[PDB]
Each structure stands twice: as structure tokens, then as C-alpha cells.
Design a protein around this ligand. Structure first.
Ligand SMILES: CC(=O)CCCCn1c(=O)c2c(ncn2C)n(C)c1=O
Ligand SMILES: CC(=O)CCCCn1c(=O)c2c(ncn2C)n(C)c1=O
Length: 567
């Protein structure tokens, strides 16, 4: 018989609560911006302007009483703590001696980072991505990059999630020496320096909090009071849609690997592994960790780093220590966590680590079978070929020959099969190796016909510099072009070449190219045919599956081909 309470939406923060507290309007150090709590604090204001208010209130979630307290006149605040994320129908009841009266139910959101409060994400996928019935044992992975939401305009709801088993989210940085990030730009370095304020060196952080959790995506229903936004709330909603999908944070990559070279000291590995455990406890939708150190022994972005004696053993120790930590998380949560790594596949990278030893701790190695040639120099070659191409000289495939200046090759040529064969020769099990496909080309200009030593093969020519182009054509950085740009502006609908380009295919290498003889523009890439060849090779050798880099650059053709090739 008191008056039933009426809920004051606005003084109750629109009924948006959360276990994780996230700064939304400011940017500072990671430990200042992100605070995970075991209990969310819930504060709901209600009023009883007519009749009598009663003495006590009870708050119910789905019919279960979760809080109680005293009615305070015509407006009352119920404050309490709650440990379980979800969406609940809340009623508030007011009671006295003459009876109790309940409010109408209202939905309350209690966010947690497994997405338990979120409906399955609504997808917006290009319908060129087709449907397949691939064996669910086969890895079909891709990388999604955090910055793809800026000029590339490629968001989580654009991914063809039903054709993926693993999404690798690139990239999570490690606080410490990171001068290589300046090659991306000063704002990107500054973002990392801001994130690491108040954070110990060797701990992980989020590089761009705006893209990870602050930015409102209207396609995901985000609003002002949504407690978790950004890419991460979308990946939480994607996991609600596809609960068997593995989403794994990738630490490192080309510009973010400089801290790994300090892991020869165990104290820094210990700091790092602890920080990864804290990161996975904070962002519960992640299913493991991918380590992308480029590269133990050196040969990455920082020319002055790399210890070929001590980096391999440090890498193996890091994989052992990560697996010990992840087994602790499995015991605490009842979940399974995976440990993986993307690795270089030149002979010079593979010789610097004993992968037979490291891989006993790992679920998968993502073999980076791409970037063998590129616009960093003027030497054309197939960047992601399976086998040795027609352009290679006598003795170059195996490495016992000499170059066109008479200088001895130092090891086997850069092809995907030379790298796979060296990993298998070490003792790495085939069923843990995942072979890489490129969803982009690399390219040059100035490869004119008079530079070719073999006039049917422009990979025997010589370039004058990097491919240039607009972002409209998929050229975000000189020398690199998205596959979907190559298909729209170089291949055309018949795949034979448009806009002055002709398509070619090295049937021995398994490698496509497009060449404009007028501008000497040449691009090396992966296409439907080379990807089918990679699938056949993975089937033949019993590999774990395929992965691609990076998903925003595909128009569906490459992922469709990965499925067709593994069928
Ligand atoms: C790793 C690779 O080959 C792709 C590089 C794309 C350029 N790039 C970044 O690497 C990057 C970045 N922001 C953070 N990171 C680590 N942006 C904006 C970027 O363009
Ligand atoms: C096959 C192998 O071991 C490759 C070694 C790295 C190739 N590579 C790059 O990827 C690269 C690069 N500059 C930018 N990037 C991304 N350079 C000079 C390079 O050699």
C-alpha cells in the first residue's frame, strides 16, 4: 500500500553500470584510465511524489531480491554492489505495515568485459564474402588492426566472422623503448608515451583508448552513457554472436617489437607476463595471447637491436612462462586460453630460435609467409610466393649460388615453402603451423621493359622507387596497396588487367603480379589462384590452416579463396 516507486532514469545514470571503470572524456596513463572492479557500484534514484512512501524498499533483478534499505521521503537513492554482468529486468518495491508495491520493470545494464551485458552484434558484411562448410578443425585466421577505424573505415561489424576461427587484434604495445613507433608518426608515439605514464616498463597497455573503448559506433547502438564503447565493446558483442570464435590480442609487430629485445633479462619477462595476466583478467573477451616479436636475433625495424645468441633462448623462456601464467588463468576461470606467435620465415630468422623447443608450449605458430620483397629497395620479387620463381638465379633457391654481382647467397631464398620446410626440419609439428596469405600487394614504379633480363618476366627488371597512389585506390603508404584496390583499379572484372596493367602469374612460384609497362608500375600480391595453391599445400602437408594479413584490405576474394583452398 505505499505508492509504487517511479525510477529517475537520469539520476541513475540511465541505468548504465559497469564492473570496469573507463575514462571516456580524457586521455592519460593506462592505470589512470582503466580500473577493473570485482563489484560494480549501482546507484538508482527513485521517487514517490503521491500518496505515502512507506518505510523500506527492496530492489529485484529478474524477480530475485538484490538490495534493501530505507525509504527517505519522496525521493530515495538505493546504493548497492553487484558482481555479475548482464541485462536484468529491475523492479523496486516500497513496503510498510499495510503492504508492498512494485515499480514497473525497467532494464538495467551491468557491463562486464566478456560482453555478458550485450546483445549479439549486428553485422554489416560485404556480401562478396561467401558461405562455406569448412571443417571446424581448420584454422582460418585474420588480423584486425585497431587503426582500421580511421581512414580505412573498417569496423568490427564489417568482418566476415562466420568465415573466421581466430581474430588477431593488432597491436598491443609494451611500455619501454619504442623509438620504432616514430616511423608511424609522432602522434602515434605520443599516444604510447601518454599510455605508459604511471606504468612500469615492460607492462602492456592499450595504444589508442579512443579506438579501443571510447569511440561511439552508432552501428553498435553506442550512446553517451554506454559504459564500454569502441572496438572492444564491438568485439564483446561479436563474441556473444559467435561464442566459438577465438579473439586474441597480438603484442608487438614491426613497429612495436623494440621492448622484446630487453627480455634477455628474466626480471623484464616476469613484469611482462604478470601484466599480460592482469590484461586478460581485465578484458575477459580475449582468449589467449599472440606474441609478434619481429624478430629474435634482429632484422626488424630497429637496425641496432638483435642478439642472435641470447634472443632464441629468451623467446623459448617467455613462451614457457606465458604458458605457466595462462594455465593459472585456466584454473581460475575454467576457460581454455591459447598461446600463439607470428614468426619470420627467412632462413636467417628461423635459425635464431629453436622452435621445436618453444612450440611445445604453444598452440599455433602463424608463419609470416609474406613481405619477402618490397618497396624498401628496388629489387622486384614475389612477396608471398609458395615456391622459387622463374626470376631466381641458378643456385639461389637453395642458397649455394651467387648473385648477379658474384656475391654468394647466404642461405635459401625467401619463399613460403623454404620457410615451412626449415620449421618442419627443426621438429615443429605440421599441425601447429598456420600458413600466411597477404591481402595486399607491395609494389614499385620504374620497372620498365628495357630493365628486364627475361622479357616475359618483370620480376627480372629493376625499379626506380615505390608504388605511389591515393587512398581511394588502397595506397595508404607508398609501396603498399590493399588487395581490394588492386582488384578495383588494376585487375578489373575479368582479372585480366585494366588502366594500363596486365595480369601475370608465375605458375612455378604460385604468385600473381600486375604490371603497367608504360609507368613501370609492378605489384606483387596474393590472388584467388595463389591462395588456392597455398590451401592445397597446407592440406598436403597437414598444416593447421591459413591466416591472412589484414582483413580490412580484402573484398572477400582472399578469404573466400582460403576456404575454397582448404575444402
Ligand atoms: C605492422 C604493419 O605492417 C602495418 C603498419 C600500418 C601502419 N600503422 C601502424 O603500424 C600503427 C598505427 N597505429 C599504431 N600502429 C602500430 N598506424 C596508425 C598505422 O598506420
Ligand atoms: C622473410 C623475412 O625473413 C623477411 C624479413 C623482413 C622483410 N622486411 C620487411 O618486412 C620490412 C622492411 N621494411 C619494412 N618492412 C615491413 N624491410 C626493410 C624488410 O626487409
Amino acid at each position: 500500500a505505499p505508492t509504487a516507486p517511479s525510477i529517475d532514469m537520469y539520476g541513475s545514470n540511465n541505468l548504465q553500470f559497469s564492473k570496469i571503470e573507463l575514462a571516456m572524456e580524457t586521455t592519460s596513463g593506462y592505470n589512470d584510465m582503466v580500473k577493473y572492479h570485482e563489484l560494480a557500484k549501482i546507484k538508482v534514484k527513485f521517487n514517490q511524489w503521491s500518496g505515502t512512501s512507506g518505510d523500506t524498499y527492496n530492489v529485484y533483478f529478474d524477480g530475485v531480491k538484490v538490495a534493501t534499505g530505507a525509504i527517505t521521503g519522496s525521493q530515495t537513492t538505493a546504493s548497492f554492489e553487484y558482481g555479475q554482468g548482464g541485462l536484468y529486468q529491475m523492479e523496486i518495491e516500497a513496503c510498510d505495515a499495510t503492504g508492498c508495491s512494485k515499480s514497473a520493470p525497467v532494464e538495467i545494464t551491468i557491463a562486464d568485459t566478456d560482453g555478458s551485458h550485450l546483445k549479439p552484434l549486428t553485422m554489416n558484411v560485404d556480401p562478396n564474402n561467401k558461405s562455406y562448410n569448412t571443417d571446424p578443425s581448420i584454422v582460418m585466421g585474420t588480423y584486425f588492426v585497431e587503426w582500421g577505424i580511421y581512414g580505412r573505415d573498417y569496423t568490427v561489424d564489417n568482418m566476415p566472422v562466420d568465415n573466421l576461427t581466430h581474430i588477431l587484434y593488432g597491436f598491443i604495445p609494451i611500455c619501454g623503448p619504442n623509438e620504432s613507433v616514430k616511423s608511424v608518426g609522432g602522434n602515434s608515439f605520443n599516444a604510447l608515451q601518454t599510455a605508459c605514464r604511471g606504468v612500469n616498463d615492460y607492462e602492456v597497455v592499450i595504444h589508442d583508448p579512443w579506438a579501443a573503448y571510447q569511440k561511439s559506433f552508432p552501428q553498435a547502438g553506442h550512446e553517451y552513457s554506454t559504459p564500454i564503447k569502441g572496438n572492444y565493446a564491438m568485439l564483446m558483442a561479436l563474441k556473444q554472436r559467435n561464442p566459438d570464435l577465438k579473439i586474441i590480442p597480438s603484442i608487438g609487430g614491426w613497429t612495436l617489437s623494440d621492448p622484446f629485445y630487453d627480455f634477455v633479462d628474466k626480471k623484464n619477462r616476469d613484469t611482462f607476463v604478470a601484466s599480460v595476466k592482469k590484461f586478460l583478467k581485465t578484458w575477459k573477451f580475449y582468449d589467449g595471447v599472440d606474441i609478434d616479436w619481429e624478430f629474435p636475433g634482429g632484422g626488424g625495424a630497429a637496425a641496432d637491436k638483435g642478439d642472435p645468441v641470447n634472443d632464441g633462448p629468451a623467446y623459448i623462456a617467455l613462451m614457457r612462462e606465458l604458458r605457466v601464467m595462462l594455465d593459472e588463468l585456466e584454473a581460475e576461470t575454467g576457460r581454455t586460453y591459447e598461446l600463439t606467435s607470428a614468426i619470420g620465415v627467412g632462413y636467417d630468422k628461423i635459425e635464431d630460435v629453436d622452435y621445436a623447443d618453444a612450440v611445445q608450449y604453444m598452440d599455433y605458430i602463424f608463419a609470416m609467409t609474406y613481405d619477402f620483397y618490397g618497396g624498401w629497395n628496388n629489387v622486384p620479387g614475389h612477396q608471398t610466393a609458395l615456391y622459387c620463381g622463374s626470376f631466381m638465379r641458378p643456385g639461389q633457391c637453395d642458397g649455394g649460388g651467387v648473385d648477379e654481382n658474384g656475391e654468394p647467397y647466404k642461405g635459401p631464398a625467401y619463399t613460403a615453402d623454404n620457410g615451412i620446410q626449415l620449421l618442419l626440419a627443426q621438429g615443429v609439428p605440421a599441425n601447429k603451423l598456420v600458413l600466411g596469405t597477404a591481402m595486399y600487394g607491395r609494389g614499385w614504379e620504374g620497372v620498365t621493359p628495357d630493365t628486364l633480363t627475361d622479357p616475359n618476366d618483370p620480376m627480372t627488371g629493376t625499379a626506380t622507387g615505390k608504388l605511389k597512389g591515393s587512398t581511394a585506390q588502397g595506397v595508404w603508404e607508398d609501396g603498399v596497396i590493399d588487395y581490394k584496390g588492386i582488384k578495383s583499379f588494376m585487375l578489373g572484372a575479368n582479372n585480366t588487367g585494366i588502366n594500363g596493367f596486365e595480369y601475370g602469374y608465375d605458375a612455378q612460384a604460385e604468385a600473381p603480379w600486375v604490371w603497367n609497362r608504360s609507368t613501370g608500375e609492378l605489384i606483387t600480391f596474393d590472388d584467388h589462384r595463389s591462395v588456392l595453391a597455398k590451401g592445397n599445400y597446407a592440406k598436403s602437408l597437414g598444416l593447421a590452416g591459413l591466416f591472412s594479413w589484414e582483413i580490412d584490405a580484402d573484398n572477400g576474394d582472399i578469404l573466400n579463396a582460403m576456404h575454397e583452398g582448404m575444402a
